[PDB]
Amino acid sequence: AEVTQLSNGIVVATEHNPSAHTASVGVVFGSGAANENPYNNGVSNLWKNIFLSKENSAVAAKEGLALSSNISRDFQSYIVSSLPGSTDKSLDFLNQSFIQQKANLLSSSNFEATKKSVLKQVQDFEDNDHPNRVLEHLHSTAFQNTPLSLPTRGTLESLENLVVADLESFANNHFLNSNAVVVGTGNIKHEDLVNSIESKNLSLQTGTKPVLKKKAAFLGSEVRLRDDTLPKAWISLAVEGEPVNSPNYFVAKLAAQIFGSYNAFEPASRLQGIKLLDNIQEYQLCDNFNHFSLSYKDSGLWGFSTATRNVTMIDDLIHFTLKQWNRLTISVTDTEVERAKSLLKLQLGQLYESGNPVNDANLLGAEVLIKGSKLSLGEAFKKIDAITVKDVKAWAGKRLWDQDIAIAGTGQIEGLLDYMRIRSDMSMMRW
Amino acid sequence: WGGFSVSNPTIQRFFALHYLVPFIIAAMVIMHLMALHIHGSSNPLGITGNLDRIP
Numbered sequence: 477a478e479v480t481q482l483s484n485g486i487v488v489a490t491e492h493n494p495s496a497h498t499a500s501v502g503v504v505f506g507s508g509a510a511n512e513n514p515y516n517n518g519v520s521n522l523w524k525n526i527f528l529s530k531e532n533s534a535v536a537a538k539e540g541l542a543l544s545s546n547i548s549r550d551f552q553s554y555i556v557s558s559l560p561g562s563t564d565k566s567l568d569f570l571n572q573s574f575i576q577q578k579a580n581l582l583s584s585s586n587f588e589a590t591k592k593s594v595l596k597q598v599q600d601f602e603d604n605d606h607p608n609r610v611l612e613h614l615h616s617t618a619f620q621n622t623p624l625s626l627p628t629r630g631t632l633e634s635l636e637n638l639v640v641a642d643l644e645s646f647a648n649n650h651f652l653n654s655n656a657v658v659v660g661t662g663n664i665k666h667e668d669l670v671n672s673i674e675s676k677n678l679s680l681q682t683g684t685k686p687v688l689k690k691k692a693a694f695l696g697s698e699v700r701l702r703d704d705t706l707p708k709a710w711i712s713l714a715v716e717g718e719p720v721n722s723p724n725y726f727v728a729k730l731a732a733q734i735f736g737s738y739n740a741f742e743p744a745s746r747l748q749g750i751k752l753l754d755n756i757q758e759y760q761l762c763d764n765f766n767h768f769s770l771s772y773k774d775s776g777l778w779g780f781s782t783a784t785r786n787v788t789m790i791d792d793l794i795h796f797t798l799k800q801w802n803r804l805t806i807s808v809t810d811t812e813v814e815r816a817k818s819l820l821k822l823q824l825g826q827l828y829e830s831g832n833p834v835n836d837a838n839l840l841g842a843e844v845l846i847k848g849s850k851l852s853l854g855e856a857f858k859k860i861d862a863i864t865v866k867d868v869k870a871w872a873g874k875r876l877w878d879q880d881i882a883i884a885g886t887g888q889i890e891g892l893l894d895y896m897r898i899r900s901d902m903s904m905m906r907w
Numbered sequence: 908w909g910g911f912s913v914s915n916p917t918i919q920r921f922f923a924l925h926y927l928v929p930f931i932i933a934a935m936v937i938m939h940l941m942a943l944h945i946h947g948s949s950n951p952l953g954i955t956g957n958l959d960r961i962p
């Protein structure tokens with residue numbers, strides 16, 4: 477449970493955990509899809525794909541190393557996993573690919589074979605992964621004409637028109653030092669890694685900063701992707717949430733836990749202590765749903781997602797759910813808040829502490845990049861337990877009560893009523 | 908008329924009748940609405956409305 481981080485030339489961050497069996501090293505950049513443009517959208521996803529290409533991947537495999545990378549909105553990360561002993565051979569492969577081979581990975585035979593893969597990849601996504609496709613579109617309309625609206629995997633149109641020069645252009649503007657953090661998780665010590673790094677000098681484009689832009693903003697709107705040939709209806713709905721490093725980051729995350737997630741087929745799920753289940757189970761209004769409090773640097777999204785085959789009662793699904801959310805402003809109970817506290821701790825635990833160093837790396841790098849440090853799991857619990865009913869009520873009265881929303885859906889959505897109908901349910905009549 | 912000409916039996920039955928008929932119109936208006944509900948309203952384009960309706 478130690479968050480160690482020191483700066484010499486490069487800001488090095490590590491979180492050691494003795495019993496681990498393995499160790500992971502890599503760099504995480506403070507720039508992701510939210511830094512691209514509508515036309516070069518998909519560059520970051522492309523980088524990730526070449527970094528994992530058959531050529532580069534075969535080199536580290538001989539050495540007994542494994543590769544992993546993830547593209548997000550605010551950040552990007554390249555990671556190399558290894559045994560606790562080869563904690564040095566990872567640092568060689570890292571520098572070899574980001575300085576020496578930052579021109580060998582971009583050959584006219586590799587880039588074309590990779591481009592052909594992300595194209596079949598992103599296409600496959602839009603053709604079949606409906607729930608994620610919808611959540612991606614939710615960000616698209618909620619933050620339109622603003623950074624957060626750009627899909628992480630990029631659009632098929634900005635992708636097929638992307639050239640090697642664009643990769644370089646992006647890389648030379650974001651893969652800088654002042655916008656980077658070298659992460660090390662697994663078992664290796666902070667002082668073990670920091671030495672192998674402060675050994676090899678060379679700055680490589682120092683003093684350079686990435687370009688700036690215009691702040692992200694929420695806009696009440698919707699995008700309806702009707703498709704009557706699909707067998708279900710997938711919809712996502714949300715209000716403007718909380719950004720990371722916000723006084724209410726936790727109240728919000730707790731508020732989502734109150735309604736939580738559900739799966740109509742799993743017996744135990746049907747028994748949960750969520751009032752909403754009394755309303756939706758009578759006529760079986762949906763196969764599943766899940767609330768969330770997504771947070772980013774400039775903004776966030778608080779809402780839920782759901783999938784259903786009861787295409788003639790979608791208005792009741794949406795109506796009941798939004799009536800429950802009304803309660804957070806006027807009648808949420810102590811026991812509901814308490815049930816949430818326990819469950820939030822359990823999930824926040826399983827995330828920050830799993831048996832996989834790669835997840836730890838991403839989380840560590842991402843956090844240190846936005847707030848210059850990581851909040852310890854124990855420090856979180858103290859904040860979570862401190863939340864009162866009054867807090868939830870004040871938060872909801874600001875974020876949920878009579879506030880614009882964003883909607884997105886695909887499939888048999890004829891039954892999803894108009895905007896103003898849904899919008900009206902964000903409140904209740906009173907004397 | 909109820910007599911030789913328009914007289915006292917006429918106007919009195921006319922009042923009784925004037926009060927009655929409006930309630931028959933009301934019942935007829937309900938049947939009008941029932942008939943309207945099975946296929947719905949038409950629209951200025953003269954074609955189907957089934958592809959885009961609002962509450």
Ligand code: HEC
Pocket residue numbers: 932936939943947948949950
């Ligand atoms: C001789 C014809 C006729 C008479 C008189 C008539 N209606 Fe209608 N009404 C129609 C028709 C036809 C429609 C269907 C309109 C459409 O959808 O194009 C209609 C539709 C309606 C509608 C739907 C909205 C609209 O205006 O289109 C209402 C309400 C209605 N009528 C009420 C009444 C009432 C109340 C009366 C009188 C007491 C009445 N109508 C008398 C022919 C009539």
